[PDB]
Amino acid sequence: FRKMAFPSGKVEGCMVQVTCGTTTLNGLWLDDVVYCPRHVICTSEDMLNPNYEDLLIRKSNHNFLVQAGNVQLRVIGHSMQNCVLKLKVDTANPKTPKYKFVRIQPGQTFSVLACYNGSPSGVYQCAMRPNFTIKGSFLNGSCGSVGFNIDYDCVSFCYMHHMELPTGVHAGTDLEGNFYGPFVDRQTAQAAGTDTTITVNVLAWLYAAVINGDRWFLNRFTTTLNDFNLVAMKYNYEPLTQDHVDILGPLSAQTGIAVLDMCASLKELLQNGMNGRTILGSALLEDEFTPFDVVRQCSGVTFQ
């Protein structure tokens, strides 16, 4: 089991450059619309608290330079939806994959295609933290890079990059321009809420350990969900939702270990330590691998 990105080719064919003034960032070209962060229309003397509505009144179609490589795509319409700008262009992208826009929950993972000037430079796997930040890797000019999942041949876009926070973590929106968490696209220092450990993913990691025959931590206890949730929060663990219980179903069926029995096993690991031992080679409990991520990597048949 390993942290793996989705192949990025379907997304690479969608990356473009958007320039307004001397500010260049990345945009996402799907059919005849280009999606990008709206702060591309900001000047260096106006980022502190931009009035985006009045800044955009000042802009016409001909103020936007959209480029696929060095090839210009003429902008024939523009609008703002929350914190994203939607630029209608004169050319439908022939590389447009089958796609959806989706808003992910904390704990869900996705691949990020980090881009600069519309040129992809790297791909890595991220998790949405419970405080709605991501521990990403972004340099200047990265805004507009997107995060995504791929299921069969459909790309589910879930993240567009906008901000770095003082602590070095990152914040952004879904593809309707709505920020994850309490952040705003302003040139200010914004504090992330206090983070927690992603319980459902820890449990997925324990199931993965069991699947591999590493199962010393399986105890003889069970628990109710409410009892577990109340203890978990005292160790800075997220509480479990009904949806979390249900996405652990397949792993519970595969191993024969009831979800609530594994919760009792995790509770013991929180109240005592690992003694000295490790799980899957590590002394730390991994929390950025989802139940889906574990199920996929069990065999070639499921991973394809």
Ligand X SMILES: *C(=O)[C@H](C[C@@H]1CCNC1=O)NC(=O)[C@H](CCCC)NC(=O)/C=C/c1ccccc1
Closest by CA position to 149, among listed 127, 118, 181, 177 = 127
**Phi, psi at residue 207, to the nearest 5°?**
-60, -45
Q: Which of residues 69-108 bind ligand X (CB under 6 A)?
A: none
8 A C-beta contact, residue 112 and residue 159: yes
Q: Is the CA virtual torsion 100, 105, 109, 115 positive or negative?
A: positive
Query: Which does residue 275 bind out of ligand X, its own copies, none, counting CB within 5 to 8 angstroms by kind?
Result: none
For residue 163, the partner it binds in ligand X, its own copies, none, with Cβ less than 5 to 8 A by kind, is ligand X
DSSP code for 38: G
139 binds ligand X (CB under 6 A): yes
Q: How far is the CB of 260 from its own copies (least distance, A)?
A: 28
Choose which of 42, 175, 198, 285 interacts with ligand X (CB under 6 A): 42
From 5-13, 84-92, 179-187, 209-217, span contacting ligand X (CB under 6 A): 179-187
Select 27 or 177, whichever has its Cβ closest to its own copies: 27
Give the one residue of 18, 25, 112, 128 binding ligand X; rule: CB under 6 A.
Answer: 25
Whichever of 41 and 126 has its CB closer to its own copies, that residue is 126
3-state SS assignment for residue 297: coil
Name the binder of 109 from ligand X, its own copies, none, CB < 5-8 A by kind. Answer: none
What residue ranges bind its own copies (CB under 8 A)?
A: 1-10, 12-13, 113-114, 116-117, 119-126, 135-142, 164, 168-170, 212-213, 278, 282-284, 296-297, 299-301, 303-304
* Dihedral angle sign, alpha carbons of residues 235, 238, 242, 245: negative
Instruction: Give, as one character, the DSSP assignment of residue 237.
Output: B
CB of 177 to ligand X, least distance (A): 13
**Residues with active-site annotation:** 39, 143
Chain mean position to CA 131: 12
Q: Which is nearer to its own copies, 1 or 235 (CB)?
A: 1
CA–CA distances in Å: residue 161 to residues 23, 113, 142, 148, 206:
15, 10, 7, 12, 31
Length of the chain: 304
Q: Which does 156 bind (CB under 5 to 8 A by kind): ligand X, its own copies, none?
A: none
Cα–Cα distance measured from residue 286 to residue 128, given in angstroms and rounded to the nearest whole number: 14
In angstroms, what is the minimal distance from the CB of 77 to its own copies?
28
Q: How many Å apart are CA 43 and CA 19, to the nearest integer?
A: 12
DSSP notation for 17-33 = EEEETTEEEEEEEETTE
Q: How far is the CB of 66 from ligand X (least distance, A)?
A: 16
**According to CB under 6 A, which one of 105, 121, 178, 187 is a site residue for ligand X?**
187
Both tokens of residue 249? 């179903």
Q: What does DSSP assign to residue 188?
A: S
For residue 288, give the 3-state DSSP assignment.
coil
Of 262 and 294, the one with the shorter C-beta distance to ligand X is 294
Chain centroid offset of residue 160 CA:
9
| 178 phi and psi angles, rounded to 5 deg | -95, 120
Q: How far is the CB of 137 from ligand X (least distance, A)?
A: 9
Is 256 or 300 the residue whose CB approaches its own copies more closely? 300
State which residue has the least CB distance to ligand X.
Answer: 143
Question: Is 287 a residue that touches ligand X (CB under 6 A)?
Answer: no
Q: Which residues are near ligand X by CB under 6 A?
A: 25, 39, 42, 47, 138-143, 162-164, 166, 170, 185-189
